[PDB]
From a paper:
The AcrA-AcrB-TolC complex is a secondary active antiport system in Escherichia coli, powered by the electrochemical proton gradient across the inner membrane of this Gram-negative bacterium. Its biological function is to capture cytotoxic compounds from either the periplasmic space or the inner membrane, and to expel them across the outer membrane, into the extracellular medium. AcrB is the inner-membrane component of the system, and is responsible for both substrate recognition and energy transduction. The asymmetric trimer structures indicate that this domain also cycles between three distinct conformations, and point to several ionizable residues in its core (D407, D408, K940 and R971) that might function as a proton-relay network.
To further assess the proposed proton-relay mechanism and its influence on the conformation of the TM domain, we solved the atomic structures of four AcrB variants, namely K940A, R971A, D407N and D408N, all of which abolish the drug-efflux activity of AcrB. Electron-density maps for these variants could be resolved at resolutions ranging from 2.0 to 2.3 Å, which are sufficient to discern the precise configuration of side-chains and structural waters inside the TM domain. In all cases, the crystal structures represent an asymmetric configuration of the AcrB trimer. None of the substitutions studied caused significant changes in the internal structure of the R1 and R2 repeats, compared to the wildtype L, T and O states. The relative orientation of these two repeats is also unchanged in the K940A and D408N mutants, as is the side-chain configuration of the proton-relay network, aside from the mutations. That is, these two substitutions appear to perturb the conformational cycle of the transporter by altering the energetic balance between the L, T and O states, rather than by precluding the protomers from adopting native-like conformations in each of these states. Similarly for the D408N variant, D407 is predicted to become protonated only in the O state, while the substituted N408 is evidently neutral throughout the cycle (K940 and R971 are protonated in all states in both mutants). These results imply that the ionic interactions across the R1-R2 interface that stabilize the L and T states are weakened in the mutants. By contrast, the O state is probably less affected (K940A) or not at all (D408N), since the repeats become disengaged in this state. Because the porter and transmembrane domains are necessarily coupled, it is conceivable that the DARPins inhibit the structural impact of the mutations, that is, only the strongest perturbations (R971A and D407N) would translate into noticeable structural differences in our experiment.
Numbering used by the authors:
A (entry chain B): 50 to 145
B (entry chain B): 674 to 913
C (entry chain A): 1 to 1044
D (entry chain C): 146 to 241
Write the structure that this text describes.
Amino acid sequence: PGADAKTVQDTVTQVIEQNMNGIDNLMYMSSNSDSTGTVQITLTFESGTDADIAQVQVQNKLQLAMPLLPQEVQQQGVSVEKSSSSFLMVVGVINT
Amino acid sequence: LGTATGFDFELIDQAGLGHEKLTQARNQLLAEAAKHPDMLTSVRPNGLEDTPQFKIDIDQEKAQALGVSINDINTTLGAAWGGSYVNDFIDRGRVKKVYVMSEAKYRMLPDDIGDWYVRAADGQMVPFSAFSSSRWEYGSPRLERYNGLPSMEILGQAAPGKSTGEAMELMEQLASKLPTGVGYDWTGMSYQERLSGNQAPSLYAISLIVVFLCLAALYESWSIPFSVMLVVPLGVIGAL
Amino acid sequence: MPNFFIDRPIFAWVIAIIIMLAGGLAILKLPVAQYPTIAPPAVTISASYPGADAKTVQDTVTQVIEQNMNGIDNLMYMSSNSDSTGTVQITLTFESGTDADIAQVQVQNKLQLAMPLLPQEVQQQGVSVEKSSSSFLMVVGVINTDGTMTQEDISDYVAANMKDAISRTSGVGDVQLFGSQYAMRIWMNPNELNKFQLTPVDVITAIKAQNAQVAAGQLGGTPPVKGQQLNASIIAQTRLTSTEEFGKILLKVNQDGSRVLLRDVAKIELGGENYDIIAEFNGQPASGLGIKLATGANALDTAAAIRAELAKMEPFFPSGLKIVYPYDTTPFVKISIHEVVKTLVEAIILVFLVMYLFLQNFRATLIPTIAVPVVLLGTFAVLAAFGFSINTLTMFGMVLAIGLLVDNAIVVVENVERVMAEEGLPPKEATRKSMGQIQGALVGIAMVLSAVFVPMAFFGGSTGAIYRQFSITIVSAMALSVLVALILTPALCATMLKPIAKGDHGEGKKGFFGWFNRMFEKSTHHYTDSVGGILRSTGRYLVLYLIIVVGMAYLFVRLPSSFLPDEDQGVFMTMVQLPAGATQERTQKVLNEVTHYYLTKEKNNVESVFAVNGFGFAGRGQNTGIAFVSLKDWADRPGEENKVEAITMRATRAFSQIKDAMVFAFNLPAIVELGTATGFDFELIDQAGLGHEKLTQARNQLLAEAAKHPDMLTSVRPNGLEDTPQFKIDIDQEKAQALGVSINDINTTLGAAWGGSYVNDFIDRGRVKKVYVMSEAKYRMLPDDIGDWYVRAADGQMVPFSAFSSSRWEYGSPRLERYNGLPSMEILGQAAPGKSTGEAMELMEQLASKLPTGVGYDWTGMSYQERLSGNQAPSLYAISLIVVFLCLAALYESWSIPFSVMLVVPLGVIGALLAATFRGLTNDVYFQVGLLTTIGLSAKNAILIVEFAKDLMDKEGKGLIEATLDAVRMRLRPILMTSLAFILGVMPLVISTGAGSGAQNAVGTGVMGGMVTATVLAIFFVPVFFVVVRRRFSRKNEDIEHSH
Amino acid sequence: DGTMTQEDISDYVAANMKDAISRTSGVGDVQLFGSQYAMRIWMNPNELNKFQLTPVDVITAIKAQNAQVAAGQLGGTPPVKGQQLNASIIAQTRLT
Ligand SMILES: CCCCCCCCCCCCO[C@@H]1O[C@H](CO)[C@@H](O[C@H]2O[C@H](CO)[C@@H](O)[C@H](O)[C@H]2O)[C@H](O)[C@H]1O
């Protein structure tokens, strides 16, 4: 919260990236750090890789990098998730 | 997946170069790409341009002389202007966050900075303006990295009539003329071609060889299979 | 089938071709490895506590983690080292076949319960969980050939630009930097600190406050007021980037307004996170990456991927920077495999030549020959089908299978040839007649033969996977060659064989073939004459046979037994260990001596030496080091004296004359995680809170008692380090309270100055790196230096350490070991010459039962493996022999006639035993599988002999003796063709020098010896076997005529 | 033999048996029917009041005086060249 892109990159992104070692079947890794105080690191695995094993290996390497992150970032927590781009549907809720 | 005839290219800082030199190398690559409308079209950054930002320098000596601590100064600035997650409360049986932050009208403009006071050790309130100075500068609102190195993603496509393979070949050629320390890589749809497009030839070959061998077995003949294999273009011309 | 393809040769071809395409495609895609993986997965936990002594590490980290290690599937045991480098490694070792991914997941789920209980400084160093081999896959070295970069420069370059990408490469289980990344180093001066009434606590506070990255929000940030037109990020403090910026950190402003800057109380410089690891490549400054393979990953693929990654980095190197390859286990695998491929190709050429000697027409010799590549290539397809890899064992399976393969096609071609020499029938009809009489037998034989090889697919333990590689490869190839002989060979016979007129034996041919044919024909007659003779005696040969069986027994019980030969792999390692307390400088002196020896005394043999000071097999320390040695090619290192075993012996002997260090060169074992045989791995255990000193005393008593049994045990020794002097300092609580100095200030001042303290991060050329505060060297060298450090009391007074503390020398451990959660001390040793490992262990157990109360023991590693136990040989081969007899009984519809075939077994074994015995070889995996190969094939020769004889006595009239003679007459040529072709085919193996020639010699010698005696002897003894067994288990009336 | 009470027995099995049992083959979870020893400080509020102390002071002194300190080394790296002595500095250790 309230971090500029450089701050995000140099206290969060680089630290997580430096810890993404010893994970199987990684093809490549990319990230964005922006001035909305947000970072997303995406790791892409070989076709046929077990998506659950990929995710738990990532999340376990992250777990061990958490103590190296800023306190307020540890507070917000760092989400590790499977990446989909398709929704089955979007339910809107409005007040009229 | 793909933009069809599209490619997905990463410009990479391979040395100590930094965001500005990487941006200059990107602009150099983009200008050169633009000079080949015949081959390349719509090659462009995927990310964001540098923007003005407000640099504020805390004066350590003056803070120390006024008895104002750097932690008070920095949480005052950040909490007021950036907002700050304090802890949790319980709203109707669900745990939720508590945030402190300045009401909007006191964190809108540079003159507002001086309306925030910090308490010194001796009880006095010190306006932020007494121990800081500010200036405009440019910086990035979105920094990209690729395989752990600073990067800039570039999108584009083969010009009409041209193959994506052709368009990628030029991009590598243009990229080979960039400043020292600047490298590149293919990602996404492009990565899955420089690897997963070398296959088509050998798979079609296996198909054609096994077809011939099955036919030769059927007809007990090494030549008669040819009279069947010759049909292929007859359907294909009509589809085309 | 044979009839079908006799009419349809092109369909036959199409089947053969599809099989080869499938094999060919398997070969391009199949994993290649030296051996099947038989090593138990190991997960390692590593952590670091900067400036901690071994006990602090143990009681504050290691015990905490160990106590949370439970409910983990397939855990065999756990071991740990806590050392005065501040390092912990905990190794959890799992059952063979454990999914290493899940092992790692389950270990980490427990570890995360311990994590919050660990010291903060330990958590910030990052603890790691890895799943990899214990040994290095390769060492990637980096030098600067322009001398433009120091050791420290190169190390930082490597850490900052190369290591991470390599660390992320799939199959890379662990990466060790030989050197250290740069950190912002703040070297504190206690004199200057006291002059300005500051301490390391103030220095640390100032750095955290002034090397900061502040989140400051935005101008016009959401939610905004209405009408807002400006939106921009506020940028406040950012991480410092240079020594200059750190130097001007403001510590305080003096009473008269002057400033005290960080550079006024410290030297500030870019320097290593640590200064323990220093490497050289052939004497020059170097750094590097020691790379370990992730559990179960493919070594050749992982190495290819590492090279591809390094290739991406090279174009951006600073000037002079260069990658070198001082140590790589990879090449030997590729090379030794190709050497076997080469001998398989030579085998096919040799086969072609021997075929051309008996079949004297190019087209006719192509028939048996083409079978080889069809079968062999199809075997790769079957291996793919069953998830096997291309490895040393499957490749040698192919080779050992050559005789069994080629024999099916030879049996078919030869028999067709004879049918055309006996009756003058034309090719297409001759092969039909021929397939009619043998095809059933070929299929039957494939069944009995599978009984000799399938049982060893059921060996248990780690050893079993080895034998299963052979079993499946040989059974598959053998099954494929029967198929190939029923489909392709009959077709090729009916189309490519030259018509033979009746009664013709080419005796009236031209030059040499005409001569050869005349010799063979007369030899055949002199052959049949000889046998006809012995059949009239028989009693004589029955006795001679028992002689052979007895000698066979003799040789066998006196042939030593090994597992897999030790190969010269063109690389090896040298271990350097000085006593704890030794300095880095003395360790460098001993490394210089090691390096010197290889560069000057082994000029002709050693290509390079990558030596590292501060890293050893058991990990970081001032008193340890290692040298990685790469030899010149095997080709340029001719003779036994120039191979790894002779080199390492010479080297170790020369190094024994090095003062006050343990230095030895050793060749890496075939496996490793198998057991450098004769060796045992012992754990002494503190089972009752006895404590370190008592365990030591118990250890010493055991070591003493062991030494006085040199007949049984040799080199029984501790694996760890001896206690050393340590500086004990007591803080006086009352005095501190009285003076008003906080214990926290005291401890931080002490620890930061003498141990160093990781404060926070900074940005060095775009990359986040660490900032370290520590005393400059010259103020943390001497005991008296302690009192030059001052702490500030509450009332502002500077108080020297000497005012609130006292100190004394004492002894302590630099390396505390634990085994399965308890204090331990590992003890290594071996069986004395002539006595067995099991013997040595029982003695060790007997000695260990006499130690003081509360002291127990346990076996681990190689000694754990052998106690689940082996000795499954007798049973499995016993089953094998029974099933073979049962299969033969079905074949002959007789309970007795099988014995006439099975008696042939000793005749090849004796030749293999003689050959191995007098070449000084051993009873190992290659000897054993070779024996089954020889036995199978001569069993097969015997089967077709008595099958032919039995047919004569049954279908035709022919009495016993006549049938036997005409049967053996008919099967002499076919037998010789195969034997001579296989015996000559394996010459490449017996004559082999160079990469993997250890395995190749072991293979070839057994087979060649076995094959020669099997061929020469069975040709005479199988006739005896049949006539004697027929007579002994005779019914009522026969022999004298047989009706019709 | 009347030499161990229940609380003793429980400490013995917690401290010497439970860990190994819980790592034994096929064992999934292990419940101790009792409790391992801890060092028990049983405070008396009257005596605390008498000396004007609280549990806060007690807790503070225990963290300060029951400590295991990383204290560094003599002659550790990087050394002054020519250094002969390398030795661990041992400061406060845990009370026992
Ligand atoms: C007598 C006939 C049967 C005997 C011959 C059998 C040979 C068996 C030993 C082969 C060892 C396997 O070695 C294997 O070689 C092939 C061919 O270069 C490699 O194949 C590699 O190069 C080829 C092109 O040259 C590519 O199509 C392939 O994508 C690439 O991986 C494999 O990566 C390697 O693992």
